[PDB]
């Protein structure tokens, strides 16, 4: 009588828990990603006494992830993803391809929607990475274990406006700096602000592998550049 039946089908072939988790993520802060020739980009918008990346996390030397949704579930899944990457390296003596890690983490996501009586993870990921077989890859993963591959996408609040801006501006032959400027422009557009503030920005990029996590001053420099244009 106290059981909620989290792993049951709704009358429409829909899972109510998965839909509500999707809603919760849609109410999360916006995270974006796009592919350049130089590498992958992930942008994200974060009281004055807060000291501290809370949207972008490193999974492996060649994989990193932007988060949307519940932060604690995101931390659990990030830890488990790091575990999978390291176990792949342990088993095969080679780095794990990005798609394989995405499939493993999404399987863990989905088993919570098929097995047991627990709730799903209320988190969605933008997994960016580089491997030799498939070059640079960006993946979107939703709470139900479905995933998709993208050249540029957005998650979180107002993802439609960011998606429209990305589609209108994202080219194939854009360099790292142009990609970063586009990322800042999308972050500003989705906030409905003419200028993006340099305290609500989380930018990082992965290139061939090395990852840069931009400090506030480098963000300020990128803001100056974006403002000149």
């Amino acid at each position: 009588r106290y059981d909620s039946r989290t792993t049951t089908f709704s009358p429409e072939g829909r899972l109510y828990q998965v839909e509500y988790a999707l809603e919760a993520i849609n109410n999360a802060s916006i995270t974006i990603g796009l592919i350049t020739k130089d590498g992958v980009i992930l942008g994200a918008d974060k009281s004055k006494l807060i000291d501290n990346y809370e949207k972008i996390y490193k999974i492996d030397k060649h994989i990193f992830c932007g988060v949307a949704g519940l932060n604690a579930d995101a931390n659990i899944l990030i830890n488990q993803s790091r575990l999978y990457a390291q176990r792949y390296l342990y088993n095969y003596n080679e780095v794990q391809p990005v798609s394989q890690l995405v499939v493993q983490i999404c399987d863990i996501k989905q088993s919570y929607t098929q097995y047991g009586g627990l709730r799903p993870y209320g988190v969605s990921f933008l997994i960016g990475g580089y491997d030799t077989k498939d070059g640079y890859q960006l993946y979107h993963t939703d709470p139900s274990g479905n995933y998709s591959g993208w050249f540029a996408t957005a998650i979180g609040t107002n993802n439609l406006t960011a998606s429209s801006v990305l589609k209108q501006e994202w080219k194939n032959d854009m360099t790292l700096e142009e990609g970063l400027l586009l990322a800042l422009k999308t972050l500003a557009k989705s906030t409905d602000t003419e200028i993006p503030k340099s305290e609500k920005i989380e930018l990082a990029y992965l290139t061939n592998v090395y990852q840069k996590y931009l400090t506030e001053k480098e963000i300020e420099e990128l803001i100056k550049l974006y403002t000149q244009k």
């Binding site: 009281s47 006494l49 807060i50 709730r119």
Partner: protein, 216 residues
């Protein structure tokens, strides 16, 4: 028999976590202030109860201390668990557990109770203050299992006003004692027998005489 009692609401919220947050917000005030050379955690508490037996501030390890706002029993359980995890890290690596890693492990343990079946979330919020080779850290752990990195914060009743007070009196380059005075002022705004303070040397909890010496 094992099924989640914490479930997504139709709007995407975890109402049990929101209710635990309400409970913590209706709890006694605690706060922390990270100084340039140290970090302090302070808290506020009938002629019969022994004071020494109900200290909210506790010691996780020689350089790590913890305070809470919420349910005392949950705090006792989580304190024993945090001590266990610190000792496990010490056995593994031969050094004191780093503050951030302890915060992550306890955050994972707290999040587990928001998803596993047949358990309610922890009805407490934690402030963990510690020193490691990478400086002084002051972290807050929520009932949800998320951990924030702070320079200063308050986690109990009327904590909006206390947060505003700390904001209007916080400077990074502050001695330990300037921070201790600011903390006492903040607690007196929320409100020597009513004050418990711990400071980071190995983590230390101020004696009643010392606290009164600060109240002058």
């Amino acid at each position: 028999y094992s099924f989640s009692l914490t479930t997504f609401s139709p709007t995407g919220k975890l109402v049990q976590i929101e209710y635990a947050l309400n409970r913590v917000s209706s709890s006694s005030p605690a706060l922390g202030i990270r100084a340039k050379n140290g970090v302090i955690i302070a808290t506020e508490k009938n002629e019969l109860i022994e004071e020494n037996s109900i200290f909210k501030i506790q010691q996780i390890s020689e350089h790590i201390g913890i305070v809470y706002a919420g349910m005392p029993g949950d705090f006792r359980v989580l304190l024993k668990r945090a001590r266990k995890e610190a000792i496990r890290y010490s056995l593994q690596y031969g050094s004191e557990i780093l503050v951030k890693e302890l915060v992550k492990i306890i955050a994972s343990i707290v999040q587990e109770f928001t998803q596993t079946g047949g358990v309610r979330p922890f009805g407490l919020s934690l402030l963990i203050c510690g020193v490691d080779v990478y400086g002084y850290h002051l972290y807050q752990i929520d009932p949800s299992g998320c951990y924030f990195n702070w320079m200063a914060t308050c986690v109990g009743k009327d904590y909006q006003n206390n947060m505003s007070f700390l904001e209007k009196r916080y400077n990074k380059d502050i001695e330990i004692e300037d921070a201790i005075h600011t903390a006492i002022l903040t607690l007196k705004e929320s409100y020597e027998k009513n004050i418990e303070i711990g400071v980071a040397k190995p983590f230390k909890i101020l004696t009643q005489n010392e606290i009164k010496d600060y109240l002058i």
